[PDB]
Amino acid sequence: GHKEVQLKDQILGVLDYLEKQQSAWPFLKPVSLSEAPDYYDIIKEPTDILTMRRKARHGDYKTKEDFGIELKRMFDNCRLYNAPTTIYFKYANELQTLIWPKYEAI
Protein backbone atom coordinates (compact mmCIF):
# COMPACT_ATOMS: atom_id res chain seq x y z
CA GLY A 1 0.00 0.00 0.00
CA HIS A 2 1.02 3.64 0.29
CA LYS A 3 3.52 3.09 3.10
CA GLU A 4 5.47 0.51 1.08
CA VAL A 5 5.39 2.75 -1.99
CA GLN A 6 6.64 5.73 -0.01
CA LEU A 7 9.33 3.59 1.60
CA LYS A 8 10.49 2.25 -1.78
CA ASP A 9 10.83 5.78 -3.10
CA GLN A 10 12.76 6.86 0.01
CA ILE A 11 15.12 3.90 -0.18
CA LEU A 12 15.82 4.59 -3.85
CA GLY A 13 16.56 8.21 -2.94
CA VAL A 14 19.13 7.06 -0.41
CA LEU A 15 20.70 4.67 -2.91
CA ASP A 16 20.83 7.48 -5.49
CA TYR A 17 22.83 9.66 -3.11
CA LEU A 18 24.99 6.71 -2.12
CA GLU A 19 25.85 5.79 -5.69
CA LYS A 20 27.18 9.22 -6.68
CA GLN A 21 29.84 9.49 -3.94
CA GLN A 22 33.50 8.93 -4.88
CA SER A 23 33.80 6.35 -2.11
CA ALA A 24 31.03 4.22 -3.65
CA TRP A 25 33.11 2.62 -6.43
CA PRO A 26 33.95 -0.63 -4.55
CA PHE A 27 30.28 -1.21 -3.73
CA LEU A 28 28.42 -0.59 -6.98
CA LYS A 29 27.79 -4.16 -8.07
CA PRO A 30 28.18 -7.75 -6.84
CA VAL A 31 31.66 -9.18 -6.48
CA SER A 32 32.32 -11.36 -9.52
CA LEU A 33 32.06 -15.05 -8.63
CA SER A 34 34.17 -15.79 -11.71
CA GLU A 35 36.95 -13.38 -10.74
CA ALA A 36 36.89 -13.77 -6.96
CA PRO A 37 35.61 -17.12 -5.73
CA ASP A 38 37.59 -16.71 -2.49
CA TYR A 39 35.43 -13.69 -1.56
CA TYR A 40 32.38 -15.89 -1.21
CA ASP A 41 34.27 -18.35 0.99
CA ILE A 42 34.44 -15.56 3.60
CA ILE A 43 31.38 -13.40 2.93
CA LYS A 44 28.18 -15.41 3.34
CA GLU A 45 25.66 -12.59 3.17
CA PRO A 46 26.84 -10.57 0.15
CA THR A 47 25.26 -7.35 -0.99
CA ASP A 48 25.96 -4.27 -3.08
CA ILE A 49 24.28 -1.11 -4.28
CA LEU A 50 22.86 -2.50 -7.55
CA THR A 51 21.35 -5.52 -5.79
CA MET A 52 19.76 -3.31 -3.14
CA ARG A 53 18.40 -1.03 -5.87
CA ARG A 54 16.82 -3.92 -7.76
CA LYS A 55 15.41 -5.36 -4.54
CA ALA A 56 13.95 -1.97 -3.60
CA ARG A 57 12.36 -1.46 -7.02
CA HIS A 58 10.68 -4.85 -6.72
CA GLY A 59 9.27 -4.23 -3.26
CA ASP A 60 11.53 -6.61 -1.38
CA TYR A 61 12.02 -4.20 1.55
CA LYS A 62 8.90 -4.33 3.72
CA THR A 63 10.24 -1.94 6.36
CA LYS A 64 12.99 0.63 6.77
CA GLU A 65 14.88 -1.70 9.09
CA ASP A 66 15.00 -4.49 6.47
CA PHE A 67 16.89 -2.08 4.23
CA GLY A 68 19.04 -0.84 7.12
CA ILE A 69 20.19 -4.36 7.97
CA GLU A 70 21.40 -4.92 4.41
CA LEU A 71 22.97 -1.47 4.01
CA LYS A 72 24.88 -1.95 7.27
CA ARG A 73 26.01 -5.40 6.13
CA MET A 74 27.48 -3.97 2.93
CA PHE A 75 29.93 -1.92 5.00
CA ASP A 76 30.51 -4.64 7.58
CA ASN A 77 31.35 -7.14 4.82
CA CYS A 78 34.04 -4.89 3.41
CA ARG A 79 35.60 -4.38 6.85
CA LEU A 80 35.55 -8.14 7.43
CA TYR A 81 37.09 -9.09 4.08
CA ASN A 82 39.56 -6.26 3.48
CA ALA A 83 42.36 -5.07 5.74
CA PRO A 84 41.98 -1.87 7.81
CA THR A 85 44.82 -0.22 5.87
CA THR A 86 43.24 -0.66 2.42
CA ILE A 87 41.56 2.13 0.47
CA TYR A 88 38.47 -0.11 0.36
CA PHE A 89 38.16 -0.18 4.16
CA LYS A 90 38.68 3.58 4.25
CA TYR A 91 36.02 4.09 1.55
CA ALA A 92 33.59 1.91 3.52
CA ASN A 93 34.18 4.18 6.51
CA GLU A 94 33.81 7.38 4.49
CA LEU A 95 30.67 6.22 2.68
CA GLN A 96 28.92 4.87 5.78
CA THR A 97 29.64 8.16 7.55
CA LEU A 98 28.02 10.02 4.66
CA ILE A 99 24.99 7.80 4.25
CA TRP A 100 23.97 6.81 7.76
CA PRO A 101 22.28 10.14 8.57
CA LYS A 102 20.30 9.81 5.31
CA TYR A 103 19.27 6.31 6.30
CA GLU A 104 18.22 7.46 9.80
CA ALA A 105 16.11 10.23 8.25
CA ILE A 106 13.93 7.72 6.37
Are the C-beta atoms of 29 and 50 separated by less than 8 Å? yes
Resolution (A): 1.5
Cα separation, 103 vs 101, whole angstroms: 5
- Enumerate domains of the chain plus CATH numbers: 1-106 (1.20.920.10)
Tell me the three-class secondary structure of the chain, residue by residue.
CHHHHHHHHHHHHHHHHHHCCHHHHHHCCCCCCCCCCCHHHHCCCCCCHHHHHHHHHCCCCCCHHHHHHHHHHHHHHHHHHCCCCCHHHHHHHHHHHHHHHHHHCC
By what method was this entry solved? X-ray
